[PDB]
Design a binder for this molecule. Sequence first.
Ligand SMILES: Cc1cc2nc3c(=O)[nH]c(=O)nc-3n(C[C@H](O)[C@H](O)[C@H](O)COP(=O)(O)OP(=O)(O)OC[C@H]3O[C@@H](n4cnc5c(N)ncnc54)[C@H](O)[C@@H]3O)c2cc1C
Ligand SMILES: Cc1cc2nc3c(=O)[nH]c(=O)nc-3n(C[C@H](O)[C@H](O)[C@H](O)COP(=O)(O)OP(=O)(O)OC[C@H]3O[C@@H](n4cnc5c(N)ncnc54)[C@H](O)[C@@H]3O)c2cc1C
Lengths: 258, 258
Amino acid sequence: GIPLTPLFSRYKDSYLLYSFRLIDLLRASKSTHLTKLLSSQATYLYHFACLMKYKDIQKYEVQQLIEWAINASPDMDLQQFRIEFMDKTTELNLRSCQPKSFTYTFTTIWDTMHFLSLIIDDMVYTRDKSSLDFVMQQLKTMKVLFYNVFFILQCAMCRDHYMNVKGFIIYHIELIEIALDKEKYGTDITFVDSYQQETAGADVAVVSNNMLMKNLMAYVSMTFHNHINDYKWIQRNKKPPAHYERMTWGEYKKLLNL
Amino acid sequence: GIPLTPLFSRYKDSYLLYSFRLIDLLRASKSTHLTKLLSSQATYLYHFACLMKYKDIQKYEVQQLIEWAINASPDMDLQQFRIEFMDKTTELNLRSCQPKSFTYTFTTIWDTMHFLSLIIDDMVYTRDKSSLDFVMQQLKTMKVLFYNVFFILQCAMCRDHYMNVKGFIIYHIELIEIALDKEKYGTDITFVDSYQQETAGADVAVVSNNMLMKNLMAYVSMTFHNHINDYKWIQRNKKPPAHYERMTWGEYKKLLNL
Ligand SMILES: Cc1cc2nc3c(=O)[nH]c(=O)nc-3n(C[C@H](O)[C@H](O)[C@H](O)COP(=O)(O)OP(=O)(O)OC[C@H]3O[C@@H](n4cnc5c(N)ncnc54)[C@H](O)[C@@H]3O)c2cc1C
Ligand SMILES: Cc1cc2nc3c(=O)[nH]c(=O)nc-3n(C[C@H](O)[C@H](O)[C@H](O)COP(=O)(O)OP(=O)(O)OC[C@H]3O[C@@H](n4cnc5c(N)ncnc54)[C@H](O)[C@@H]3O)c2cc1C
């Protein structure tokens, strides 16, 4: 139930490009351990792409795609892998998982993280349908995706920094788990409009309060994204550029029609 | 400039007990790598104990204490190490670093984390004195302390969970670094009373706003502590006990006279 907007369309495409570049790494994997980690990450990523598009995951078709990527020739170049990827996904009836744009940049990875955040918010708000158990399983998978992020591009500094602060995101996913658990035991979730209301609601001695900010992960990922960009100037020991600009929640909500 | 209260007194003692138990591990270290990690952690811990007590770190005396612990007999039992520790610290004029209580529990580690949080808040509010550079260095050390936490007691589940969410704490330390950097470049820090005000202040497109919650780390560590205890019921797949009780900011501020 995510609003259709130009930005969300870009997020979807970026997410598919990221997943495509991730499976392209399988044939070049330097170890069984890495192949396993990459294959699992890819399986989960495509699962969420299909959940939104097909309102279900094509566990079978996705597995066939991943199996194909694992066995693809390592001598093959990216252009050839692209071509064979398009043919394979067409054959597997996964045309909706094909990227339209192939320009890979940091925006691609950020877009991917923001896309997953919107999925989390949507799966929770519409939990009326699958089941609290299904959602809980999905959140566990989301934590694995965020605990493990493959940059594909090279940036050791980014990797080290993310290692240090990724817990900020994971912490909020756990807040959702707690809210769902409270609902299982009798207290329905009350959605609020601001992060401030959620913070105030959490400042109690009892567990009978169950307030959760609507669009929480969208806000959390936006805030995290701003933080990384605010901190890079400290990493470079420099004053931020005169035209450095941060994203505001009001602007972000408008862009995604939240 | 931390208020003297019964709770803070307990925090101080717990912090010293934690540090004592950490250096007791040196003589039993299974590798040079571990000895280095433990020695560095211990050096930083004692540095902050002395900073508060002696308004400076006894880099020399602390180094002598650590060197002593590294060379202590591995066959020695904890009671004997205690005795020799008391004699060594007396000799090194570090009597103020001697624990009064020796009962080690999870409370000991939590107290240690809350103590460091109060130190961070105090060093920042009174930055008028050392220098922005000194404080920045201290914060870097604090991040290392929180990125690395030795439980001493055994709890693999705790370790794994902390690994996943410690970024929530580190994220807020980086927020302080950003605030100090903004001050270096011309914008003084404006302290606010609530986390909600800090959140609202951060929701801007410019970098000219520099609002920081007073007692931020005290609030962050309290919130984190509540979160870990809220989540353990999910880990155990059980409803929280009927008498489970959480800490509130109002109660916490009163206990520490913040
Ligand atoms: C997980 C991760 C960690 C990183 N760690 C580091 C690091 O430690 N150091 C470092 O130097 N670089 C790091 N980077 C890269 C850095 O965040 C920027 O992507 C890069 O410097 C390029 O900046 P940019 O000016 O092109 O903007 P980008 O941030 O790349 O912009 C990408 C897109 O996101 C939009 N956008 C900007 N801010 C927000 C927001 N808050 N919420 C939503 N959309 C927004 C932009 O409008 C644009 O369309 C990291 C990237 C990722 C994905
Ligand atoms: C970093 C860390 C991670 C841990 N991870 C796990 C885990 O994943 N799973 C698990 O089962 N256990 C975990 N634990 C242990 C758990 O947090 C408890 O300490 C333990 O279960 C004992 O609970 P208790 O009821 O004795 O209260 P404790 O939380 O141990 O109480 C210690 C003291 O802190 C006070 N206090 C309580 N809440 C707060 C608060 N929010 N702020 C400040 N003071 C407060 C109490 O009043 C008491 O004096 C972890 C401990 C630490 C230090």
